[PDB]
């Protein structure tokens, strides 16, 4: 049963961002409003009973608000009023500011068996962790998922959503029924919807997908050159890929992007990577060599001023296993949750 | 001048006949480890090259090695007793670890052992740590990463692994100084980089480092200048992406990682991020991912996605240090790092 659901959307979307910063109408298409308010509109046009919670009326003009009201969306300023309404709750909080606050505000008011979905930025696993004390105790009925759009809702390019489902390591953050409800809601207005494990969904579909796609292209370039030209052993290539990506992630975590750049040194990196220009067409490498030679002088200045903080070489998944064997599964999971919250929530 | 031992002449068939370095990059054979030996000997050092496989190069190339004043031996133990500095140019499998373990109890007092390519000096240290801890507290571990094949014109420097960013000294200042001088005496520049990052900047995986970095900087620019996303958000997203990718390859291999991330979905989302006039990194990526090899395309669907735990790695390291104490946390980090990168 997935027709005429009661839906709550939180956040109309920063129309100044969409209209003037991204200039979506002229460069991508569609008409405002965009984002969360457009999601509410499309859900309502699909026959769902939709409430949009938005505390700031001034976030868009009266003329765009009329578009929302005409779709039959009910607009409220109080998140708690939207919380009591919906069986599915969609957080449209792109800048990861309000996401935790709104979730914490609504969790003790949402109806029995409600599911709460984040749309972008914050990973549903991190959202689950932030809510876990109540989800484990008083609200075991509530599910956590996500509904990541492929492009800003309202633009022609938005043709699907990615829904965060059971994690690769077997964690169910929402019931099968709750996930099915999110999937079918996502399909409103003719959209495609795909379930991807919740521990990877944000890396595939959110704005960080830019980094994912470019890093992946480098990984595949090296895999090809490594195997087909150099005949470097596969396990060696994988070990180097792991160490590269892990080191880069760890340095950003301790030292920020500027500190990470300072540690890896573009000038050294250009010299080493030039030696790997070994086949016909490696446009990813060509592009990187040119970008790294032409860094912004403002970025460069902040890089000399940056401090490289202590950063420990790890094999991360191997370390997880090792921690489980030392202190047991429950305590290891506690350690993983606490440290994930310290980086991604606090 | 210094007593130097080099281990491994280099696969001349690979450099000359498979890769055709003389015509595609330049220079003349031999390349790799035997060329390092030649250059060190021509700079006035007392060099032994240990190479058990006489057939690894033609007779004429061996004559070049000998004419440079390199002493060639077939036994790694003889080379072990010779050198104050030991440079491993070792087949890029497990031979690095075997040769290191073979020489460590025979090298002189205060010797330093340097790897050249592939293996991180931190991992080499971990592989030898039960011996370094106790019987050979005097022996240092470092690296001399050429960052190009020695003998090619592109080889102009070495990257030397120094004190780690978290403050571990795997070799003394005096040992690191020898590696620097060994590089400078052969007309190369020498750059000391923390040992925990040196293989990432200098070895073949630097291809991946450069391309991944360019994407990180692309998003940093979009994020700050167009979206006005907060810096910490941008950083959190970068960390999540790079960590998830590393973790998926660790559990599931490159194909499993590709399967988990789904190139078609990824292409669609990343396309929406073409928000600047020139993002050649993104353009190149979209073309690469849209046009994957049909054989590669095939082994990805066949791949299994294994259990993979979302972590904040450095936060988790701090968390384990406080939980079980620094000594036990370091043991856990060492063992688990050896399990992936050595075993």
User: Hey, which residues does B157 pair with through a beta bridge?
Assistant: B189
**Computed from CA positions of residues A232, A233, A236, A238, in that sequence, does the dihedral angle turn out positive or negative?**
positive
DSSP state of B152: B
Q: Cβ(A264)–Cβ(B245) under 8 Å?
A: no
**Computed from CA positions of residues A250, A146, A332, B129, in that sequence, does the dihedral angle turn out positive or negative?**
negative
Size of chain A in residues = 346
The angle at the Cα of B48, spanning B43 to B54, to the nearest 5 degrees, equals 120
CA distance A156 to A149: 12
Query: Between chains, do B265 and A205 touch, taking CB under 8 Å as contact?
Result: yes
- Give CA B150 to chain center in angstroms: 15
Query: Between chains, do A217 and B242 touch, taking CB under 8 Å as contact?
Result: no
Q: Cβ(A45)–Cβ(A117) under 8 Å?
A: no
Q: Cβ(B264)–Cβ(B292) under 8 Å?
A: no
Q: Cβ(B129)–Cβ(B113) under 8 Å?
A: no
Both tokens of A122, joined, read: 């914050």
The angle at the Cα of A56, spanning A51 to A59, to the nearest 5 degrees, equals 100
CA distance A318 to A316: 5
Q: Cβ(B66)–Cβ(B72) under 8 Å?
A: yes
The number of C-alpha atoms within 13 Å of B20 and in the hemisphere containing its C-beta is 5
Query: Between chains, do A272 and B332 touch, taking CB under 8 Å as contact?
Result: no
- Give CA B93 to chain center in angstroms: 12
Q: Cβ(A47)–Cβ(A127) under 8 Å?
A: no
* SS3 of residue A71 by DSSP: coil
Q: Cβ(A48)–Cβ(A85) under 8 Å?
A: no
- H helix or E strand, kind and range, residue A197: strand A192-197
Contacts of A58 (CB under 8 A, 6+ apart): none
The minimal CB distance from A253 to the residues B229, B309, B314 is found for: B314
**Computed from CA positions of residues A225, A226, A228, A234, in that sequence, does the dihedral angle turn out positive or negative?**
negative
Q: Which residues of chain A neighbour B115 with C-beta distances below 8 Å?
A: none
Query: Between chains, do A339 and B323 touch, taking CB under 8 Å as contact?
Result: no
Q: Which residues of chain A neighbour B208 with C-beta distances below 8 Å?
A: 215, 218-219, 221-222, 240-241, 244-245
**Computed from CA positions of residues B141, B159, B56, B42, in that sequence, does the dihedral angle turn out positive or negative?**
negative
Query: Between chains, do A253 and B212 touch, taking CB under 8 Å as contact?
Result: no
Find which of A212, A261, A293, A345 to mutate to test the B interface (most B CBs within 10 Å of its CB): A212
Query: Between chains, do A240 and B118 touch, taking CB under 8 Å as contact?
Result: yes
Query: Between chains, do A220 and B296 touch, taking CB under 8 Å as contact?
Result: yes
Ramachandran bin of A154, using left for φ above 0, alpha for ψ from -120 to 50, beta for the remaining angles: left
Residue B78 dihedral angles phi and psi, to the nearest 5°: -65, -40
Helical residues (DSSP H) of A6-97, grouped into ranges: 15-16, 24-27, 36-45, 62-70, 79-85
Q: Cβ(A124)–Cβ(A96) under 8 Å?
A: no
Least CA distance to A28: which residue of chain B? B272
CA distance B84 to B82: 7
Domain A1-207 class in CATH: alpha beta
* Residue A289: how many other CB atoms lie within 10 Å: 21
Query: Between chains, do B244 and A199 touch, taking CB under 8 Å as contact?
Result: yes
Q: Which of A57, A18, A11 is nearest to A34 (CA)?
A: A18
User: How close are the terminal C-alpha atoms of chain B, in Å?
Assistant: 37
Task: Count Cβ neighbours within 10 Å for each residue of A107-132 and write b for 16 or more, e otherwise.
Answer: beebbeebbbbbbbbbbbbbbbbbbe
CA distance A56 to A37: 13
Query: Between chains, do A214 and B285 touch, taking CB under 8 Å as contact?
Result: yes
Strand pairing of B46-50 and B71-73?
A: parallel
The angle at the Cα of A49, spanning A47 to A50, to the nearest 5 degrees, equals 110
Query: Between chains, do A21 and B209 touch, taking CB under 8 Å as contact?
Result: no
CATH of domain B205-310: 1.20.120.1300
Q: Cβ(B341)–Cβ(A239) under 8 Å?
A: yes
Size of chain B in residues = 343
Distance from CA of A284 to the nearest CA of B (A): 5
DSSP state of A225: I
Query: Between chains, do B207 and A225 touch, taking CB under 8 Å as contact?
Result: yes
Q: Which residues of chain A neighbour B147 with C-beta distances below 8 Å?
A: 268, 271-272, 275
Strand pairing of A148-149 and A160-165?
A: antiparallel
Number of H helices, E strands in chain B: 16, 8
Query: Between chains, do B288 and A245 touch, taking CB under 8 Å as contact?
Result: no
Place of tokens 């990984």: A219
Strand pairing of A148-149 and B3-7?
A: unpaired
The angle at the Cα of B271, spanning B212 to B313, to the nearest 5 degrees, equals 35
Q: Which residues of chain B neighbour A310 with C-beta distances below 8 Å?
A: 165-167
The count of CB pairs under 8 A between chains A and B is 491
CA distance B317 to A315: 11
Q: Cβ(B240)–Cβ(A123) under 8 Å?
A: yes
* SS3 of residue A326 by DSSP: helix
Q: Which residues of chain A neighbour B291 with C-beta distances below 8 Å?
A: none
* Residue B260: how many other CB atoms lie within 10 Å: 26
**Which fold would CATH assign to domain A208-313?**
1.20.120
Q: Cβ(B141)–Cβ(B113) under 8 Å?
A: yes
The minimal CB distance from A203 to the residues B218, B240, B313 is found for: B240
Q: Cβ(A213)–Cβ(B215) under 8 Å?
A: yes
Q: Cβ(B119)–Cβ(B141) under 8 Å?
A: no
Q: Which residues of chain A neighbour B220 with C-beta distances below 8 Å?
A: 257, 299
Q: Which of B172, B163, B204 is nearest to B85 (CA)?
A: B172
Find which of B16, B19, B148, B209 to mutate to test the A interface (most A CBs within 10 Å of its CB): B209
Domain B1-204 class in CATH: alpha beta
The minimal CB distance from B229 to the residues A95, A266, A313 is found for: A95
CA distance A259 to A23: 32
User: How close are the terminal C-alpha atoms of chain A, in Å?
Assistant: 38
Is A344 near chain B, with CB under 8 Å? yes
Q: Which residues of chain A from 278 to 337 reach within 8 Å of chain B, CB to CB? A: 278, 283-292, 295-296, 299, 308-323, 326-327, 331, 335-336
Is B234 near chain A, with CB under 8 Å? yes
CA distance A120 to A150: 10
Q: Which residues of chain B neighbour A125 with C-beta distances below 8 Å?
A: 310
Both tokens of B170, joined, read: 């795997």
Domain boundaries of chain A, sorted by first residue: 1-207, 208-313
Q: Cβ(A181)–Cβ(A115) under 8 Å?
A: yes
Q: Which residues of chain B neighbour A213 with C-beta distances below 8 Å?
A: 215, 266-267, 269-270, 282, 285-286, 289
Distances (CA, A) of B78 to B5, B49, B136: 9, 10, 18
* Residue A279: how many other CB atoms lie within 10 Å: 12
Q: Which residues of chain A neighbour B311 with C-beta distances below 8 Å?
A: 316, 320, 336, 339-340
Both tokens of B248, joined, read: 């998926």
CA distance A242 to B202: 15
Both tokens of B311, joined, read: 């972590």
User: Hey, which residues does B4 pair with through a beta bridge?
Assistant: B47, B85
Both tokens of A260, joined, read: 């990470």
Least CA distance to A20: which residue of chain B? B226
Q: Which residues of chain B neighbour A256 with C-beta distances below 8 Å?
A: 231, 235
Least CA distance to A258: which residue of chain B? B217
Is A346 near chain B, with CB under 8 Å? no
CA dihedral B283, B284, B289, B291 (to 10 degrees): 100
SS3 annotation, B190-201: EEEEECCCHHHH
CA distance B225 to A299: 12
Distances (CA, A) of B313 to A335, B211, B298: 11, 22, 32
Both tokens of B58, joined, read: 């033609």
Is A339 near chain B, with CB under 8 Å? yes
Q: Cβ(B215)–Cβ(A219) under 8 Å?
A: no
Both tokens of A269, joined, read: 């990196």
Is B110 near chain A, with CB under 8 Å? no
Q: Burial of B312 by CB count in 10 Å (0-12 exposed, 13-18 middle, 19+ buried)?
A: buried
Q: Which of B140, B141, B158 is nearest to B149 (CA)?
A: B158
Least CA distance to A124: which residue of chain B? B310
Residue by residue, DSSP assigns A178-194 as HHHHHHHHHTGGG-EEE
Q: Which of A250, A271, A154 is nearest to B159 (CA)?
A: A271
The angle at the Cα of B314, spanning A174 to B263, to the nearest 5 degrees, equals 55
Query: Between chains, do B215 and A220 touch, taking CB under 8 Å as contact?
Result: no
Resolution of the solved structure (Å): 1.6
Both tokens of A82, joined, read: 């939207």
Q: Cβ(B250)–Cβ(A253) under 8 Å?
A: no
Query: Between chains, do A288 and B214 touch, taking CB under 8 Å as contact?
Result: yes
Both tokens of A283, joined, read: 């446009």
* SS3 of residue A207 by DSSP: coil
Contacts of B106 (CB under 8 A, 6+ apart): B77, B80, B81
Distances (CA, A) of B262 to A69, A104, B290: 37, 32, 11
DSSP state of A153: B
User: Hey, which residues does B189 pair with through a beta bridge?
Assistant: B157
Q: Which residues of chain B from 50 to 79 reach within 8 Å of chain A, CB to CB? A: none
Query: Between chains, do A168 and B240 touch, taking CB under 8 Å as contact?
Result: no
- H helix or E strand, kind and range, residue A259: helix A234-264
Contacts of A116 (CB under 8 A, 6+ apart): A89, A91, A103, A106, A107, A110, A127, A131, A142, A143, A144, A145
Q: Cβ(B315)–Cβ(B303) under 8 Å?
A: no
């Amino acid at each position: 049963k997935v027709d005429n659901m009661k839906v709550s959307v939180y956040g109309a979307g920063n129309q100044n961002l969409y209209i003037n910063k991204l200039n979506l109408p002229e460069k991508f298409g569609g008409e405002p409003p965009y984002g969360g308010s457009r999601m509410a509109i499309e859900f309502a046009e699909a026959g769902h009973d939709v409430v949009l919670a938005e505390p700031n009326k001034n976030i868009m003009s009266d003329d765009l608000w009329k578009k929302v009201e005409d779709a039959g969306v009910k607009v409220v300023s109080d998140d708690v009023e939207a919380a009591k309404h919906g069986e599915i709750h969609v957080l449209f909080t792109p800048f990861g500011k309000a996401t935790f606050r709104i979730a914490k505000t609504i969790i003790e008011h949402v109806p029995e068996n409600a599911v709460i979905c984040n749309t972008c930025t914050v990973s549903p696993v991190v959202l689950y962790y932030s809510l876990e004390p109540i989800l484990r105790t008083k609200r075991k009925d509530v599910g956590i998922s996500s509904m990541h759009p492929a492009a800003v809702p309202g633009t022609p390019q938005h043709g699907h959503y990615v829904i965060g489902g059971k994690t690769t390591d077997g964690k169910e953050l929402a019931t099968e029924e709750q996930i099915k409800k999110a999937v079918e809601l996502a399909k409103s207005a003719g959209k495609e919807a795909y379930v991807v494990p919740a521990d990877v969904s944000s890396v595939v579909a959110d704005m960080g997908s830019l980094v994912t796609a470019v890093a992946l292209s480098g990984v595949l370039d090296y895999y090809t050159v490594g195997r087909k030209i150099i005949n470097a052993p596969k396990k060696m290539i994988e070990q180097q890929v792991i160490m590269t990506l892990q080191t880069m992630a760890s340095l950003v975590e301790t030292s920020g992007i500027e500190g990470m750049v300072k540690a890896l040194n573009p000038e050294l990196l250009i010299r080493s990577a030039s030696s790997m220009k070994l086949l016909d067409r490696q446009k990813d490498l060509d592009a990187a060599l040119e970008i790294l030679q032409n860094l912004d002088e403002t970025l460069k200045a902040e890089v000399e001023k940056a401090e490289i903080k202590p950063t420990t070489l790890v094999a991360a998944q191997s370390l997880v296993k090792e921690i489980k064997t030392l202190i047991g599964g429950a305590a290891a999971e506690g350690a993983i949750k606490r440290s994930a919250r310290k980086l991604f929530e606090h």
